[PDB]
């Protein structure tokens, strides 16, 4: 067999009482011969279950902390009130249980969940915490898309990790990772190195998630067969997008369709990206992350000409704007790259080049390294706003994530959004230039449980590149 079977997260629907029980517990995985790596998982030794929720239905998620240290649980992509998201203002202490009441009110999507612990988000995600949120609505159900979970509707969580000599997860929040992020030399696909999936002939639906702390990926097929993007971060697109290459940022989700009709086996590969620290082996060349082997069986699934009603971007005439300036300390930034170059070689650079030595507060937004006690502003609920997030005077990649909403990108790093990226998204690329998004917060977030907006390169977020804001 050699290629191990791609693990499928257990589907988890709400019980009769309308509740979902999540147990954040310790475990272990086997990735290197000899030693077993100590890991953390939700309802298991690594990653988590796929919570399937129906639009309109209420649910109370009961997160119990079976870990030696405190953790939190962000429902990434959920249009919910701040009083239900749980971040640094809703800490789940060891041995205790935290409840999150959610009333699903958003299109059918592949959303996800992960810890959002103050200054430890990168560490806890690297440790193996994470999981999926499958939202179903009426409009999507009518479509002839693959629906058989784990057979033709398959989740693909792509994460990179690095192990030490003692077979432990080598996580660091040091001078290097504060600048370029935590990258590894091992490529996990649902926690498995190069898995294999047996799919029926016809159409294969892959719910992709870039669960890397800092690594951006560029998905493609081994034989050059196109990938049909049908869904983005917060819902299906208006119509599918035919692509040969699909770049995916940290915390992004792309639902794609692949033609398995010919029955030929092929690989889902990741192409080397132009990002600092990410060009080292095994990522220096095209890397197969998932082997697809078509079975003799078939499905009646088809690629629809039109998916769902995609509203037009409203012309927000005199809406409030917000300038969010991401900032990095050059003195620390330079030391990080010098240390990266020394430890990993010149290849690390990927062909590239008000202060303090406060590495834990080196990265900021609008001059401030995340102050939980001071939200930047208050937004009126149900109003449109035009937010510009800038990354000038800094060459790093910043996938900007915004809590409690799904937005439409107006400008992505200068140029307009790509075909697939013009739908509903909660993450926007900010790399060396400025981006503009059209946001609207339909749910409140008080000072006590405020929303956040941060860079999804977890190490930048843990070193201060995060801001909070209220909605009322």
For residue 330, count CB atoms less than 10 angstroms from its CB and return exposed for 0-12, middle for 13-18, buried for 19 or more.
middle
Judged by the rule CB under 5 A, the positions of this chain that interact with Cu ion are 76, 251, 398, 455, 457, 460
Please name the residues in contact with 315: beta carbons below 8 A apart, sequence gap of 6 or more.
none
74 in a labelled binding site:
no
Query: Of 76 and 443, which has the nearer Cβ to Cu ion?
Result: 76
Tokens for 145? 């898309």
114 in a labelled binding site:
yes
Please name the residues in contact with 57: beta carbons below 8 A apart, sequence gap of 6 or more.
14, 18, 103, 104
Query: Of 299 and 413, which has the nearer Cβ to Cu ion?
Result: 413
403 in a labelled binding site:
no
- Cα 294 from chain centroid? 28
The SS3 of residue 123 is helix
CA distance 180 to 277: 6
Query: Of 443 and 460, which has the nearer Cβ to Cu ion?
Result: 460
398 in a labelled binding site:
yes
Query: Of 322 and 398, which has the nearer Cβ to Cu ion?
Result: 398
- Closest approach, Cβ 460 to Cu ion, in A, equals 3
Query: Of 125 and 241, which has the nearer Cβ to Cu ion?
Result: 125
456 in a labelled binding site:
yes
Query: Of 129 and 307, which has the nearer Cβ to Cu ion?
Result: 129
- Closest approach, Cβ 316 to Cu ion, in A, equals 26
- What does DSSP assign to residue 328? E
Find the helix or strand (DSSP H, E) in which 406 lies. Answer: none
- Closest approach, Cβ 394 to Cu ion, in A, equals 8
CA distance 287 to 198: 20
CA distance 286 to 218: 9
- Closest approach, Cβ 216 to Cu ion, in A, equals 11
- Closest approach, Cβ 290 to Cu ion, in A, equals 22
Q: How many CA atoms lie within 13 A of 273 on its CB side?
A: 21
291 in a labelled binding site:
no
Please name the residues in contact with 17: beta carbons below 8 A apart, sequence gap of 6 or more.
none
- Closest approach, Cβ 455 to Cu ion, in A, equals 3
Task: Please provide the distance, in angstroms rounded to a whole number, between the alpha carbons at the two ends of the chain.
Answer: 56
Tokens for 23? 């147990």
Binding site as annotated, residues: 76, 114, 116, 398, 454-456, 460
Binding site as annotated, residues for Cu(2+): 76, 114, 116, 398, 454-456, 460
């Amino acid at each position: 067999a050699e290629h191990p079977t791609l693990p499928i997260p257990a589907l988890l629907t709400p019980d009769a009482a309308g509740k979902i029980a999540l147990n954040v517990q310790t475990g272990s995985m086997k990735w290197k011969a000899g030693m077993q790596t100590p890991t953390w998982g939700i309802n298991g030794p690594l990653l988590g279950p796929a919570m399937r929720l129906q639009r309109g239905k209420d649910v109370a998620i009961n997160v119990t902390n079976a870990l030696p240290e405190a953790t939190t649980m962000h429902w990434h992509g959920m249009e919910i009130p701040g009083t239900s998201d749980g971040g640094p203002q809703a800490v789940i202490e060891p041995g205790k249980m935290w409840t999150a009441e959610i009333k699903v009110d958003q299109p059918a999507t592949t959303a996800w969940f992960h810890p959002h612990t103050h200054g430890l988000t990168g560490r806890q995600v690297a440790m193996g915490l994470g999981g999926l949120i499958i939202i179903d609505d009426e409009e999507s159900t009518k479509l002839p898309l693959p629906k058989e979970w784990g057979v033709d509707d398959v989740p693909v969580i792509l994460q990179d990790k690095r192990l030490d000599a003692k077979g432990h997860i080598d996580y660091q929040l040091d001078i290097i990772t504060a600048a370029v992020g935590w990258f590894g030399d091992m490529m996990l696909t649902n926690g498995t190195v190069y898995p294999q999936h047996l799919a029926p002939r016809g159409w294969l639906r892959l719910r992709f998630l870039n669960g890397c702390n800092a690594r951006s990926l560029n998905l493609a097929t081994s034989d050059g067969r196109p990938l049909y993007v049908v869904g983005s971060d917060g819902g299906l697109l208006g119509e599918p997008v035919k692509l040969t290459e699909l770049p995916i940022l940290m915390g992004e989700r792309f639902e794609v369709l692949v033609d398995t009709r010919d029955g030929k086996a092929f690989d889902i590969i990741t192409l080397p990206v132009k990002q600092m620290g990410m060009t080292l082996p095994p990522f220096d060349r095209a890397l197969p992350v998932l082997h697809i082997q078509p079975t003799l069986k078939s499905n009646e699934a088809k690629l629809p000409d039109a998916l769902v009603n995609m509203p037009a971007v409203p012309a927000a005439d005199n809406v409030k704007t917000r300038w969010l300036q991401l900032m990095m300390d050059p003195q620390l930034d330079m030391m990080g790259m010098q240390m990266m170059m020394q430890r990993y070689g010149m290849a690390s650079m990927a062909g590239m080049d008000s202060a303090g030595y406060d590495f834990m507060h080196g990265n900021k937004i609008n001059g401030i390294a995340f102050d939980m006690a001071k939200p930047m502003f208050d937004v009126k609920r149900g109003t449109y706003e035009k937010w510009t997030i800038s990354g000038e005077g800094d060459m790093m990649l910043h996938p900007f994530h915004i809590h409690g909403t799904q937005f439409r990108i107006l400008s992505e790093n200068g140029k307009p959004p790509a075909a697939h990226r013009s739908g509903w998204k909660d993450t926007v690329r900010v790399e060396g230039w400025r981006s503009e998004v059209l946001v609207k917060f339909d749910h409140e977030a008080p000072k006590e449980r405020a929303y956040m907006a941060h860079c999804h390169l977890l190490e930048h977020e843990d070193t201060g590149m995060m801001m909070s804001f209220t909605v009322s």
